[model samples]
Target: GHMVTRIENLENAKKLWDNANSMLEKGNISGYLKAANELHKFMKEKNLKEDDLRPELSDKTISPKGYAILQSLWGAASDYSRAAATLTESTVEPGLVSAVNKMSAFFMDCKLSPNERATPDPDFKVGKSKILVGIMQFIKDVADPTSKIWMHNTKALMNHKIAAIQKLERSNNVNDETLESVLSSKGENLSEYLSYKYATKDEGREHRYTASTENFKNVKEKYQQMRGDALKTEILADFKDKLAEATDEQSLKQIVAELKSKDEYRILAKGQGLTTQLLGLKTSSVSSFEKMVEETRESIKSQ
Candidate 1:
């Protein structure tokens, strides 16, 4: 055979070797090891060595180029180890898993010879709540974005979550904004109780957001009852003052008539409800300062 690379199975292996050297010579040592990792796989499949593959480069002990390759590989080892480390963060912050998986799938995609990426599938369309979707979306964008797609989509997702959180936390304060920021993050960190606290922290609107039918009904009921009670207290005070000013029998008669006819006076009060208590009912049914005018009448008559 012409060389080890002349065999059909060696075709892919040759391409990988060429790709790695091409990448490394172009000062791409950072990504060079990734290609080297792929090349290492070919080495496993064929039981080959650097000596067999490229004896020109591997002819001497620790050949300079070979040591550089080893060093480049060392760099790649760090990249992979860190890749593993970064993923555990996914457990704590699930959004990262989405971002990372998107990252991996993106690497797996191949261009058909030249920058010919397949368009996203329409039917296949569909995270924090939608975290996986976000991760993939960010992945897709970062994999290829010439201009505004990254920030456009970023801001779009931003606006979406912001509105969604506004719909939840229901306010625009500093505390509210930070809480929204945390909750907006794919909903991974913090408990549901924390989320609820975020939502309810705005003391006033908590009821507005979470109002039950009972709460809604009682909301007005309590207010109306309180207003009615307060008005009654003022009305009673007014009536007593007017009765005290009255020195005439005609005035006493009209005051008593007003008490009987008016709604505030007519509404029943019970159980320490009234602010003023009436006294002296020996010949009395109920009494007032108006009673004293009549008392003036009775006192004058009896005396």
Candidate 2:
């Protein structure tokens, strides 16, 4: 079942990539942008990476999957650079700066360390070369003072060196335990972590999951024990604000009731006085409620 699901997802991703590639080939700038965005979103949803699309490369060997990813990468980068080139005088500098920063950070993450060697596949070599050269060229074009896009690239690169370490791990082909150690020492995979973080943050307000009766009881008890009068008042006020903006009274009431339970769980979790070491446990409880709220809300709407 898992393999079947994976195959289906891969097929879907390939379709998205094809759509993006077709739009790019036809010089449809806006169409390409929309398609590329969809492709990226699909890739994230399926946890697909360039590496996943392409098998480990052997010398002078290439696969269609590898070639496709390279083509897509080059096309997207070129499109973005071209769009940056055509920006208005007032917007060009800031726009280019943003592009450079994003590309630079992406490149930094792809970097390999001294002890590491990239997979010796022909397509990997070609793809890496193209991506790096394109990034450098784009930066150079925009960084020149005489160029219209010359602007201060002031943002400090977050996790700038992390990708180099990730590449090192990949080159060495570490096992799960080794990879976990590397990840713990450096950081979580940036793309995956960002996707999850954004999803969780968005889910906090927009969706709720279902809770078991026992779980609900525990959460309710925790809330009753931890919530002070002042905190309850604040929570009530916030709930009122949400209800005012709700589209329907029925859904709003259901959500509010679930939120009240979540609020209780949150208070109890925080009141436990877990420091950084136990912070994960505290957050896990809140996440549980959030997930439950999203599930429950969806179930209600479906009925």
What are the Cα lDDT values of the candidates? 0.35, 0.38
Question: What is the alpha-carbon lDDT of model 2 when measured against the actual structure?
Answer: 0.38
| Tens-digit lDDT track of model 1 for 1-303 | 454643554556556766655654444432444465576667677776544455333321322343344333333333322332332132322333233433222222211123433333233211022222233223322332222121122222222333343334344443434433433354232122112112121222211122222222323232233332233333333443344333346666776676655444433222112222243222111223233334333311210
- TM-score of every candidate: 0.23, 0.24
lDDT, model 1, position 224: 38
Residue range 98-182, candidate 2, lDDT tens digits: 5544532232122223343323224433323223223333343234333322221211011111232334445875444543332
TM-score of 1: 0.23
Candidate 1: list runs displaced more than 4 Å. 1-8, 43-303
Highest TM-score scorer: 2
Q: Which stretches of candidate 2 lie over 4 Å from their true place?
A: 1-4, 55-303
Best model number under lDDT: 2
